[PDB]
Design a protein around this ligand. Structure first.
Ligand SMILES: NC(=O)c1ccc[n+]([C@@H]2O[C@H](COP(=O)([O-])OP(=O)(O)OC[C@H]3O[C@@H](n4cnc5c(N)ncnc54)[C@H](O)[C@@H]3O)[C@@H](O)[C@H]2O)c1
Ligand SMILES: NC(=O)c1ccc[n+]([C@@H]2O[C@H](COP(=O)([O-])OP(=O)(O)OC[C@H]3O[C@@H](n4cnc5c(N)ncnc54)[C@H](O)[C@@H]3O)[C@@H](O)[C@H]2O)c1
Lengths: 427, 425
């Protein structure tokens, strides 16, 4: 952090990321509040976590009990005497009931208001700690199995760069994977743009979690793609995702390798022909659309509609912060990455009725060749302009994607999660 | 200072409203394809120079784009003409409500537009601004309910609203007698109006025809009197958090305005910043009570006893902090997300009743609160596309737009007045 003097900014925390064998949080877990979540959750986490009843690993507050704005006082009552004790890379999650679904307008106002609390708290925490808000459907049964994959993602090292975000967990029940630490056991994952970078690390994490990976890139990058296939022990596929025949060239690979079925599609491939719109030609427009928006919609509609992905399937699309907040010289790119959010939102109901979920991850600043291609000052500021005072890592994005891919994450669809470390920029 | 230099800023002096001056710096060019271009050309022919010099405004009808391949339309219209956009020009893309699209393709493409407008917002020079307006595909072809939004955007009134998303329903609209005296004959209750923003909300309302009930607390007596005097309104002392609050306002409306008021403004707000780990009951409770409990109490109360009925308008004051959070403001932002909460929650019910409810989230606004040290003041001032802080008028204008009798199809809305501040969710 070489400009910490210039921008009056703290040294960053070394963010704790996932290691097999290590406990999920580094302290004890406090589950307070009142409502229909405190007891179930206390119950679901007894064994894997360290429930009070030193230093707090986690702080979960149950806001579902708060049915009017006057109840909000509780956030205060619970949080104030404990923040003093939140350990390194601690985890604070408020859980509320879906505001549009609330039993009163009064209730709805209190639950909506929660975001202001969580995102503000995100900005006060220290030494690597992060906040999250999670809404749960009031039609969720009292055990709330559908909430588990989400709580377990946040209440761990994996959500290391997920900060100040809002998760929406629907009403369906869920079944734990056989092994929370091998959640994608015997799953078939297609990962486009897997030669290098984020796509590659998706593959790695997927494979670490138990999945068989189909690593797609173009022939130009086969070598790095061979290197990825090897390392996850998956299979390569040389393919332009924009080609008429692409959907067919994937189903056939599935037919020769995987009984013709897949469980997970990750639309990760992308390109960035940047330029100001005043100076934008047709070719720099079209390419970006083709790769970035036209293809993922087609691979999604294609593979589902040809039966390659069916019940229990998962589709995670790679959005971007530019897609939400906009970015100078990226009217093409930000249109595609906004469209990506379109696909997630537009397709979710139809796919829901097919037992398929779809979500998007919007990465923030991530160390990659591409951030490495930005002028160093502009680059360094960018790297530092977030609650967590540093740039993300490709693992941090893959994690978010692997939380979505989870078989227990079935109650979570239509979600867009930023992996930005609570970057200051946004809509 | 080095980083200043290294990074590359030339703030345009922003053009604001002035009785008499054209609403644009040049001709309006309305293009694209779909259900909005023809009606808009006809609605706007009188007061605007349509392109049958340089571009005062550009409006692109995107409602005709039904698939992502069609997005390229945006590029074919804007690329060629952008170079000719003037000082404080306006760019507006009109689309169909994505959730209400006739296909998922359409939904994708239409949702995608915000990427475009927010980004373009960030490219425009000379203090020009971009906006996205979504129109219910259920609006009649006439598109009467859109006009008030098009006039507010396509004017200097909207000088500090940039990069925003406006969402317009299906309902038909009647235009005011006089677009320049929009609130003529209206009675507005503006709370927190002794100083700054509220005080300015009272002026703008006067300028537009309203009889203003300027409200404040006892301590503020002196500055209230000045407001009420300046705007030809009448003054009311009360603390909005009093149990008799609704009753006292109601007593006033009988004595002075036939029991009726048309618009309620929950402007009254206060801070009390403290890190949450040093937050006490008083600092929590005071803010909650003034900023969230009160505004609701007033609205529900004032609709519920009939003081504000059919044609009514409640505009509430959010804040970017309630959108993006902010250090030392768990209490404050809880309440201003609360305000959005009030807005989104009371909207269906208030619609069924003939009342629209909307919110405004100011950015950084030159005011007496903003007593913030130079270090911080300087960067919040400059961290938006317009490269400067905003004036109270810029906010009150936005509020006046909502408040128009012609803004009936506009409800549910939260609009930031931030000159597209970088900070958000
Ligand atoms: N900071 C970041 O690097 C960052 C931040 C936000 C979002 N993203 C997004 O995340 C995704 C991965 O990030 P990245 O920077 O590694 O992207 P990238 O530009 O490096 O592209 C990823 C891979 O996809 C491949 N690809 C391009 N066109 C293809 C096509 N026609 N068919 C098959 N493969 C194709 C490329 O060869 C490349 O190896 C991208 O969609 C990007 O837009 C990245
Ligand atoms: N000033 C900004 O840059 C900005 C930014 C974000 C949000 N806002 C919001 O806009 C509003 C206006 O604030 P401002 O910046 O002009 O500062 P301000 O405090 O001067 O204006 C608030 C007014 O409300 C009055 N007030 C306070 N409590 C009251 C009560 N109990 N009953 C009646 N009146 C009461 C005060 O007397 C004052 O006149 C606030 O709600 C604020 O949260 C302003």
């Amino acid at each position: 952090s070489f400009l910490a003097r210039q921008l009056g900014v703290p040294q960053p925390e070394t963010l704790r990321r996932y290691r097999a064998g290590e406990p999920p949080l580094t302290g004890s877990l406090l589950i307070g509040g009142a409502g229909r979540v405190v007891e179930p959750l206390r119950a679901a986490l007894e064994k894997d976590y360290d429930l009070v009843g030193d230093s707090f690993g986690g702080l979960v507050f149950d806001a579902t009990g708060i049915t009017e704005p006057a109840g909000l006082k509780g956030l205060h009552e619970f949080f104030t005497p404990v923040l003093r004790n939140l350990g390194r890379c601690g985890r604070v999650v408020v859980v509320g009931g879906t505001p549009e679904a609330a039993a009163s307008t009064n209730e709805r106002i209190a639950q909506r208001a929660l975001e202001g609390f969580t995102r503000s708290l995100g900005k006060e925490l220290r030494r690597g700690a992060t906040t999250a808000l999670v809404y749960l459907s009031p039609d969720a049964k009292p055990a709330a199995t559908g909430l588990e994959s989400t709580m377990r993602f946040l209440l761990s090292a994996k959500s290391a760069y997920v900060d100040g975000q809002v998760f929406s967990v629907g009403a369906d029940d869920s079944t734990p994977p056989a092994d929370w630490e091998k959640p994608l056991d015997g799953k078939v994952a297609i990962v486009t743009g897997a030669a290098r970078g984020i796509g590659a690390t998706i593959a790695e994490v997927f494979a670490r979690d138990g999945a068989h990976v189909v690593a797609i890139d173009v022939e130009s990058a086969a070598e790095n793609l061979a290197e990825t296939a090897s390392k996850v022990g998956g299979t390569a596929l040389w393919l332009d995702v924009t080609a008429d025949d692409a959907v067919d060239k994937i189903s056939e690979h599935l037919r020769d390798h995987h009984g013709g079925k897949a469980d997970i599609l990750v639309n990760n491939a992308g390109i960035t022909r940047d330029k100001l719109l005043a100076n934008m030609d047709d070719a720099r427009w079209d390419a970006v659309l083709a790769v970035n928006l036209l293809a993922p919609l087609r691979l999604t509609e294609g593979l589902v509609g040809n039966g390659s992905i069916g019940e229990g399937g998962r589709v995670i699309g790679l959005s971007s912060i530019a897609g939400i907040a906009g970015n100078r010289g990226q009217t093409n790119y930000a249109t595609t990455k906004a469209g990506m959010i379109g696909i997630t939102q537009a397709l979710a109901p139809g796919l829901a009725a097919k037992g398929i979920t779809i979500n998007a991850v919007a990465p923030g600043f991530i160390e990659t060749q591409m951030t490495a291609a930005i002028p160093l000052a502009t680059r360094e500021v960018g790297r530092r302009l977030n609650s967590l005072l540093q740039g993300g890592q490709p693992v941090d994005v893959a994690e978010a994607i692997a939380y979505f891919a989870s078989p227990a994450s079935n109650a979570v669809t239509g979600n867009v999660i930023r992996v930005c470390g609570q970057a200051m920029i946004g809509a």
